[PDB]
Amino acid sequence: VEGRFQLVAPYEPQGDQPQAIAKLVDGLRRGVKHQTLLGATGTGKTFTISNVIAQVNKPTLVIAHNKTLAGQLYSELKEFFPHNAVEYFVCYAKINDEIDKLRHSATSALFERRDVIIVASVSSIYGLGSPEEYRELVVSLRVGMEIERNALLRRLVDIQYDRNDIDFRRGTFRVRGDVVEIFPASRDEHSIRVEFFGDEIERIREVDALTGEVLGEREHVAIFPASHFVTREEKMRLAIQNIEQELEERLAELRAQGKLLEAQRLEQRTRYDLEMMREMSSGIENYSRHLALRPPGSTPYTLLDYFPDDFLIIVDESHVTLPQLRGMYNGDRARKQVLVDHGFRLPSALDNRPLTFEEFEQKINQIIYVSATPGPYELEHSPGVVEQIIRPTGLLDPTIDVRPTKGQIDDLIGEIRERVERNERTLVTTLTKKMAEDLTDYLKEAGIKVAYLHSEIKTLERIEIIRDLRLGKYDVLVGINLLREGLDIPEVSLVAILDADKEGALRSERSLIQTIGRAARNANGHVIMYADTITKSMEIAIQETKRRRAIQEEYNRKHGIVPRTVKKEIR
DNA sequence: CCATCGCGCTACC
DNA sequence: AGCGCGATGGAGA
Ligand SMILES: [Cl-]
Ligand SMILES: [Cl-]
């Protein structure tokens, strides 16, 4: 590889992926800042993007709008680039430990090699100190280097590695006479064995700690700090002093106001935190601004800042991701402020925050937004769109009937019964938790095996219910707004949309396309809208569905593609 | 106004 | 593992 991406896949680009790839790549090479990939559900957008990443060879940040999508994209990208550094940067016993490790693998990789793709959630790009410091404080070790064992040990301690001769673990180092064995914070199962002859480095080896294999000799190795908030001792002392002076003034302020409970609470928690500013703390991010000695109101350091300046950003499901990004500042600021009011945190804790949307914009080099339904921001900043409509599988956008509200529930049930005999599944979407609840009984009353999906349901149980649906424990799934982007269930032939004309965010153009899209994974995919009116949003959804289907049907007969329902392994 | 998300605190265990 | 709190998309009083 040598710092270049190698896209590995069992197939090549198909349908209209080639032109999509070509346009985006061209756009990047001409210095176009914002671009948008208008890719229909099931056109392999991640593969399209991977080809794009592979050709331009920039360090890439992939931003998902939740952990589930981040996880999937991470595992997909790992398969696509098995010889490159695909990393995973999400927020927070051993599950916590694994996340800390993966975060460290991600940041250190940005300073080890160019061929790096990091998948992060939009909420998880924080919790970091200066990248300049992170790099500057590396312990760089070379063979031949004049250095004492005890001095190397001291330098490792200063960057937060613990001596631990008994345990064999991440973020520690072992000592046996002349051999020091370092486990980087970024590795669970790999260590660096450093061998001294007198006060000189005779040999450096990479070791597989699980298998015990010695993997090779190194002339040079780089050990990165075991925390992202490490600073030099002088800077650290001054941080401590600033924190102490701030605490004094706020404690006096709170007491002057007769908020003695709050003052007590603040003093107690802060002192406790300061206790471990000698010993090792948790929640240290709250002091980030003082630790960096930076001005009040300063933009925080983020994952974006660890990337080089010529990096690439991919925003997955951009229409949801960007508004989530936009609203985080005000949301976080308001929660933190009440914590400051009740004396849980110092006022400087407000500087431990997400970026404003404007700050995010300042940090962009080049960006590609990815959505089947791009938001207005994406369209306004991108010069038109790179459209991608033809599926390598041949599958077509579904057919749509509009049917009236009268006896709709009886109509739906009969329609569903036909699917069960065809061994096919159905998805239904109502407006409210109430109606969904009623409807799910109606169906249980009529003997239909059905499950109900709503916000109260939890990740692990959601997963279970999707799985059971695919397995055939259920034939129908009912929900409100969770039968949407991300949902990939090829056994679904029917998507029912109740109150399809009852306008709002739930029945917007954008939402209709997304919900319709759940029918685009089956060769017999069909959508029924239960409405007495054809609304404008409805009008546009149906027309766009029709337009795509027509183009795809022509394409399919020009090239002799047979729409095949993608068999997808059940996990 | 509704469904849904994610975040720290507290009342739990 | 559960509270209250403010986000969000888009029409509504
Ligand atoms: Cl010793
Ligand atoms: Cl534009």
Author numbering: 1 to 92, 113 to 300, 303 to 593
What do the authors of the reporting publication say about this deposited model?
Within this complex, UvrA acts as the initial damage sensor but hands off the lesion-containing DNA to UvrB and dissociates, leaving UvrB bound to the lesion in a preincision complex, the precise nature of which is not known. Both UvrA and UvrB expend ATP to form the preincision complex, which is believed to require threading of a β-hairpin element on UvrB through the DNA duplex. UvrB presents the lesion-containing strand to UvrC, which catalyzes hydrolysis of the 5th phosphodiester bond 3′ to the lesion and then the 8th phosphodiester bond 5′ to the lesion. UvrB is classified as a member of SF2 helicases on the basis of conserved helicase motifs (I-VI) (Supplementary ).
If the UvrB helicase domain underwent rigid-body movements similar to those seen for other helicases as proposed previously, ATP-dependent domain closure would force the F-loop toward DNA, perhaps causing F527 to intercalate into the duplex stack, which may function as a “ratchet” to facilitate unidirectional translocation upon ATP-hydrolysis. Indeed, in a structure we determined of UvrB (S91C) bound to a fully base-paired DNA duplex, F527 is intercalated into a sharply bent DNA duplex; furthermore, the crystal structure of the analogous complex containing a F527A mutation revealed substantially reduced DNA bending (Supplementary ) and increased DNA disorder presumably due to the loss of “ratchet” that seems to lock the duplex DNA in position. That F527 intercalation is important functionally suggested by the reduced incision efficiency observed for the F527A mutant UvrB.
